[PDB]
Design a protein around this nucleic acid. Structure first.
Ligand SMILES: [Mg+2]
Ligand SMILES: [Mg+2]
Ligand SMILES: [Mg+2]
Ligand SMILES: [Mg+2]
Lengths: 244, 244
DNA sequence: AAAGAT
DNA sequence: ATCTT
DNA sequence: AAAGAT
DNA sequence: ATCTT
């Protein structure tokens, strides 16, 4: 399927190529930095060609946002099935040691999930799936990156800003957690687990409907939350209480 | 001076080189996207080797943040004068057609400018200068060609996501405006003007001291600013009356 | 964690 | 990291 | 703009 | 665009 093909392609590409610099048309190569600010942008660009290749193979049109602060990164759909759109968003985070727990910021909880057309390319109801392609890289020990340039012949001497990288594709609701991922930018936090759990999809919500209801009613500050719910347990007790 | 040299080097590099993609160690090239999220990352990486080259020529050490949420992008200082550090921050914005008015988000106004050691590599008082290297690019409509990968022998064929790029170096206080550049992330907004005004330094503050005082007392919401000051005129009248 | 930095 | 209405 | 999206 | 305490 589109999903199984996309997952195989992502694994393959990631295993075969290592990004090491930005290149100018003149052949000069500028090395990379090791922070997520840099790598989140790189991994997103690294994914575009793959997604588009697999999408075309399945008769899907791929669309990117026109307004820069709109979701999702890629919208896929067959022209004949306009209301069966698939959303794909890329997220990046890091680890210091390969066997540690990770968590992602998965997007806002006050935009399109609460307002059907807010900051989204197409109305939320036209999407039947929301996939997250997550990249986890291991940071390099040296806090001092290369500060010079290279030429095409020196590709093998360019230090890579990461020790390793892992990728997975999973439905957003499945990896969503119950604690906000950011404060002032009101983001949904993912589960705080090991890589394996994201791949296998061992989440905390019972269904996508529960995931949505929980985040559509989550309050912004702990002050407001203490009278409603601060986690999944309290949310379920809040349902029992009659949503008051 | 270090300043005149840095400006010349940036200006020169920018005209002679055009970044067109990210390269993998195996020689595969991935095209760039056309939004600021991508270009701001590329321009920073582009600037790094140039800054380090000119700094070394003048006997300056160049240091980058150890932690991701620290300002500035680059700290420069001579080993013999540690209390005369120079901060350089790279800022990017876009334009739809050449010669339109532009504005930048210049960083927070509630961190290191209000607390000497908050989110900054070195205590704020050890810096004698705060420079902004700003990039302005004219956005270009993405095509189908920018959605496939390329090889080294095809460098000239890869379509560029920008029409033209202009760069400038100026003091932060000189280009700082009197209205916030962002709400929830509390950022200082720059003056809203044409590129030449940034180069020439036609701002609104009379001194760096006025810029600092203005932003150290600026309130986060218009409701809190209604009784204080919302712009430079009101701020001056407020000062005149005794800050009450 | 929550809140507020980049 | 900065954009949009 | 100011406020709230990414 | 995510991170840090
Ligand atoms: Mg965006
Ligand atoms: Mg994205
Ligand atoms: Mg940073
Ligand atoms: Mg920067």
């Amino acid at each position: 399927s589109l999903r199984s093909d996309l997952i195989n392609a992502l694994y393959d590409e990631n295993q075969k190529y290592d990004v090491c610099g930005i290149i100018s048309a003149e052949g000069k190569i500028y090395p990379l930095g090791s922070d997520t600010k840099v790598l989140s942008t790189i991994f997103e660009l690294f994914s575009r060609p793959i997604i588009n290749k697999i999408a075309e193979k399945h008769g899907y049109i791929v669309e990117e946002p026109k307004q820069q602060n709109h979701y999702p990164d890629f919208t896929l759909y067959k022209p004949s099935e306009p209301n069966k759109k698939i959303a794909i968003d890329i997220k990046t985070t890091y680890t210091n040691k390969e066997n540690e727990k990770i968590k992602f910021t998965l997007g806002g909880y006050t935009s399109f999930i609460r307002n059907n057309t807010k900051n989204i390319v197409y109305p939320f109801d036209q999407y039947i799936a929301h996939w997250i392609i997550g990249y986890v890289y291991t940071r390099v020990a040296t806090r001092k990156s290369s500060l010079k340039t290279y030429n095409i012949n020196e590709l093998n001497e360019i230090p890579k800003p990461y020790k390793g990288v892992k990728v997975f594709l999973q439905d957003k609701w499945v990896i969503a957690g119950d604690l906000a991922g950011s404060g002032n930018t009101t983001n949904i936090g993912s589960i705080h687990a090991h890589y394996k759990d994201f791949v296998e999809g061992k989440g905390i919500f019972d269904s996508e409907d529960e995931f949505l209801d929980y985040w559509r009613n989550y309050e912004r500050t702990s002050q407001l939350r203490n009278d409603k719910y601060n986690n999944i347990s309290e949310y379920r007790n809040w349902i029992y209480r009659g949503r008051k």
